[PDB]
Design a protein around this ligand. Structure first.
Ligand SMILES: Nc1nc2c(ncn2[C@@H]2O[C@H](COP(=O)(O)OP(=O)(O)O)[C@@H](O)[C@H]2O)c(=O)[nH]1
Lengths: 184, 192, 96, 427
């Protein structure tokens, strides 16, 4: 699904100013909460996820476990607030000869092992709002070497404040974007 | 635990100043009979700290806002009275009602901001204070994707804990974090 | 064929011109900047298609690129022989 | 896809908003405790606009109640839908105003601000699409007017794009309830003009006049007047929640009606209105709706449009009707009264239809218009203010707050400038 729809420019997947921004998103909560609130930081719409055990609390898209996304765009951009706590998220991608491949990055990670079934990345952020961009095509060709194929599933875990999750066809720097597709 | 009798009521019936709520002036919530600078700090402020435990007017309104004004106007002198404030402050926290602790956390946040030396002097007193915080730490509620009103009451007690703990952690210095771990297992440092 | 997958989502840079007289193809990407090592095997795969829209694009793109590319075809021979083998072993009435 | 957070200052405003929630819950079929027990699946198409769901199948409304003394909140909790409001939705001050506009704004406003802003805050990042708040307040009093104007500024600062839709009750010019009122309204107008995107004016004198022209209620109470205001609010926000055949929202209405940034004060009206006994005789049709909407005896504003001319107009319809009949009316009544339409702004009238009418009232309509007749309203309060100001006895009450004497003059100068702007635009 998303297969036959037009996919050019920008294509968002979570943005808290719709009507049920998790209408396509699925939430799993344990030892924590998904709560939606306002920050004095930006005065603009945000969602919060906080939990004691990060692995047991996450959001995944799409809702249907058996069904998958057909988004073509190679760039995934996250605009999130770092809560000075343990954070992780994972992405699923298909490759040229049809093997499912998955990346999961963590801030409490240690190494960058690329054993076949799942790749792991350590990363560090800045306290406040971050604007991480993940070029899936570059990463797939760098790690495994296979070219890029459309993206299957996206999951974000607890202890982070997320306000946008959108895809872009190519890399846009600041101000070559819609005025709200950036940081206030 | 019954309502341990508050000294502030006994000081207020005969001698306390903040009765004045009358304005033809560009002034705030409360007024003083005399300028607070002339007052001593060993007698008035500890009594004011005890008054936050009051539940009915006019006692608690004067005590809460009187504490805020005194801590704002006279931040230099409060360092001497810091040891004497532990006992009345510890009385208020043990009430555990979701209203007194909000006032106490507001005072504490207004207290640590006054001087980094004050917070360094509160490091030995963490063990006397934090157990109430260590109980209420994880009382947030799961609502999913829809709305929080509690913050206009300013009564989401958990969120007050997080900011206030972050405030002692910044001003506490080198040994504040390890003491916090000894009281709060689920806390993780926000030093950077 | 797999060539259906790329064309079905508007990835193959070709379009059809209905100049009434002979159906012809137009390039969304000029042949100069085309990555022959990537696009050439896909055009060879489209020959196995049956219905008209993919069949016409496959023939025109394959013949055009082969007859104008030049020496750039030489490196792509081992990659395009395998789809050519798949096309032949169909034993089809008109794919052969 | 359009979620609105509703704000209520005002002893008047809090009562009006409560009756509005009565109307919405009856329309949607909501138990005054928030449990759905209705009969129409269309009621849940867009219920998220006005409500939240709490875990347990309970719906909580996007309602903010603002006051400075707990008396009104105690009355609201004694109301039918007091349990519908989340208990944290209410805030009240601890030092009353007594309709002193300066006291509420200056001394009480600053303390109130740090508390009040943050539901306006945390509703914003969690109301699923914020394209506008909604505020109902009184202008003659001190608590609603001063605090509402102050919060309107903070709403504009924190939320620039979101539409600040405001509904205000104008001081009654023959007699209104308060008499600090000319001072209060003068100071609130200057704040309202610059920040609020839309301002709607209602007069109690017109409401009583309408009741005795149309309703023939021998002895009405406040409940009827606030119910009519609830009808107007239901008609204004109906297009967002329910289907139709042609619909305009708040931003469309701002686009369609506002020709210039400061000419956005609008009159409001509702049809049909009929006495409880004579409704049987009346055959309710589209021409009957059009005649009632544009008839002067039905305007809920103390300003005769016949003394002025129309700039822009808007009409909305609830229920299933033919568009040809509606637009047949919109041409012929536009041509009938060419003496009231400005020559260089044609297309003054706009049309809209919503599919679901309210209960019992099979066919419904709501009219919002713009006319130069607004100039009479500001003239009356200016005339009353002039000799009151001419002997400064009352401003010393406001000066002791901290308000400068020059503050009254800049509001008066802005008021006169606003009057002049509407005078040139007539020609
Ligand atoms: N229309 C209407 N007006 C009311 C009602 N209750 C109070 N008012 C008006 O509210 C005004 C006084 O408001 P005030 O006590 O100063 O509170 P404020 O609205 O916050 O300024 C008076 O002019 C009353 O006429 C009501 O039920 N309906």
């Amino acid at each position: 699904m998303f297969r036959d729809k037009y996919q050019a420019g920008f294509l968002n997947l979570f943005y808290s100013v719709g009507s049920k921004p998790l209408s396509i998103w699925e939430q799993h909560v344990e030892n924590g909460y998904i709560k939606r609130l306002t920050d004095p930081d930006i005065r603009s719409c945000v969602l919060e996820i906080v939990s004691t055990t990060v692995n047991n609390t996450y959001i995944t898209c799409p809702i249907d476990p058996k069904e998958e996304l057909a988004i073509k765009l190679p760039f995934l951009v996250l605009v999130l607030k770092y809560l000075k706590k343990y954070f992780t998220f994972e992405i699923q991608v298909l490759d040229d000869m049809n093997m499912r491949r998955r990346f999961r990055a963590s801030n409490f990670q240690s190494k960058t092992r690329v054993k076949p079934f799942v790749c792991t990345l350590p990363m560090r952020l800045d306290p406040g709002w971050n604007q991480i961009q993940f070029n899936l095509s570059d990463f797939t060709r760098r790690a495994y070497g296979t070219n890029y194929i459309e993206t299957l599933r996206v999951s974000v875990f607890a202890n982070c404040r997320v306000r946008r999750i959108y895809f872009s066809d190519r890399l846009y720097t600041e101000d070559e974007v819609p005025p709200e597709y950036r940081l206030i | 635990p019954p309502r341990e009798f508050t000294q502030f009521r006994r000081f207020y019936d005969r001698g306390d100043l903040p009765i004045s709520r009358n304005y033809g002036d560009e002034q705030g919530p409360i007024h003083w009979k005399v300028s607070p600078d002339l007052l001593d700090y060993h007698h008035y402020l500890p009594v004011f700290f005890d008054g936050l435990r009051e539940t009915e007017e006019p006692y608690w309104y004067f005590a809460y806002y009187g504490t805020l004004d005194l801590i704002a106007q006279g931040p230099t002198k409060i360092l001497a009275v810091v040891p004497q404030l532990i006992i009345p402050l510890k009385k208020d926290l043990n009430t555990r009602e979701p209203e007194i602790l909000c006032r106490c956390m507001a005072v504490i946040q207004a207290l640590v901001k006054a001087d980094p030396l004050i917070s360094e002097a509160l490091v030995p007193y963490y063990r006397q204070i934090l157990p109430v915080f260590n109980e209420f730490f994880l009382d947030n509620k799961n609502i999913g994707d829809r709305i929080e009103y509690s913050q206009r009451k300013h009564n989401n007690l958990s969120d007050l804990i997080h900011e206030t703990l972050e405030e002692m952690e910044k001003s506490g210095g080198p040994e504040a974090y390890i003491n916090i771990k000894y009281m709060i297992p689920s806390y993780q440092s926000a030093v950077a | 064929t797999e060539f259906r997958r790329f064309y079905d989502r508007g990835d193959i840079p070709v379009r059809l011109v209905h100049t009434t007289f002979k159906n012809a193809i137009a390039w969304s990407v000029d042949p100069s900047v085309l990555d022959y090592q990537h696009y050439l095997p896909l055009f060879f795969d489209g020959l196995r298609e049956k219905e008209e829209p993919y069949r016409f694009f496959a023939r025109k793109g394959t013949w055009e690129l082969l007859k104008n590319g030049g020496t750039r075809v030489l490196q792509c021979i081992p990659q395009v022989v395998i789809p050519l083998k798949k096309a032949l072993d169909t034993r089809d009435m008109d794919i052969v | 896809v359009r979620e609105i957070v509703h704000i209520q200052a005002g002893q008047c405003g809090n009562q009006i908003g409560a009756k509005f929630w009565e109307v919405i819950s009856d329309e949607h079929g909501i138990d005054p405790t928030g449990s759905y027990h209705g009969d129409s699946d269309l009621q849940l198409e867009r219920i998220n606009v006005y409500y939240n769901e709490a875990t347990g199948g309970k719906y909580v409304p996007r309602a903010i109640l603002v006051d400075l003394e707990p008396g009104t909140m105690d009355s609201v909790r004694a109301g039918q839908f007091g349990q519908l409001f989340r208990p944290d939705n209410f805030v009240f001050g601890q030092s009353g105003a007594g309709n002193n506009w300066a006291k509420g704004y200056y001394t009480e406003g600053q303390e109130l601000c740090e508390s009040i802003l943050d539901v306006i805050r945390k509703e914003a990042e969690s109301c699923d699409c914020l394209q506008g708040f909604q505020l109902v307040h009184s202008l003659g009093g001190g608590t609603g007017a001063g605090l509402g104007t102050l919060l309107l500024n903070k709403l504009r600062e924190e939320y620039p794009d979101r539409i600040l839709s405001t509904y205000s009750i104008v001081p009654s010019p023959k007699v209104s309830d308060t008499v600090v009122e000319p001072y209060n309204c003068t100071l609130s107008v200057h704040q309202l003009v610059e920040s609020a995107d839309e301002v709607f004016c209602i007069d109690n004198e017109a409401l009583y006049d309408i009741c005795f022209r149309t309703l023939k209620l021998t002895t009405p109470t406040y409940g009827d007047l606030n119910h009519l205001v609830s009808m107007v609010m239901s008609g204004t926000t109906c297009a967002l929640r329910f289907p139709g055949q042609l619909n305009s929202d708040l931003r469309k209405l701002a686009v369609n009606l506002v020709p210039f940034p400061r000419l956005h004060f609008f009159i409001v009206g509702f049809a049909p209105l009929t006495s409880r006994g004579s409704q049987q005789y009346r055959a309710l049709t589209v021409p009957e709706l059009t005649s009632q909407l544009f008839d002067n005896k039905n305007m809920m504003a103390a300003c005769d449009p016949r003394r002025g001319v129309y700039l822009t107009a808007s009409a909305h319809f609830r229920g299933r009707m033919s568009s040809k009949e509606v637009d047949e009316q919109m041409l012929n009544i536009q041509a009938r009264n060419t003496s009231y339409f400005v020559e260089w702004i044609p297309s003054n009238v706009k049309s809209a239809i919503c599919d679901i009418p309210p209960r019992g009232l099979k066919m419904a309509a709501t009219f919002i218009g713009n006319t130069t007749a607004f100039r009479e309203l500001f003239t009356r309060v200016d005339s009353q203010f002039q000799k009151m100001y001419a002997r400064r006895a009352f401003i010393h009450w406001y000066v002791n707050e901290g308000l400068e004497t020059v503050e009254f003059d800049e509001a008066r100068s802005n008021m006169t400038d606003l009057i002049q702007e509407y005078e040139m635009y007539e020609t």
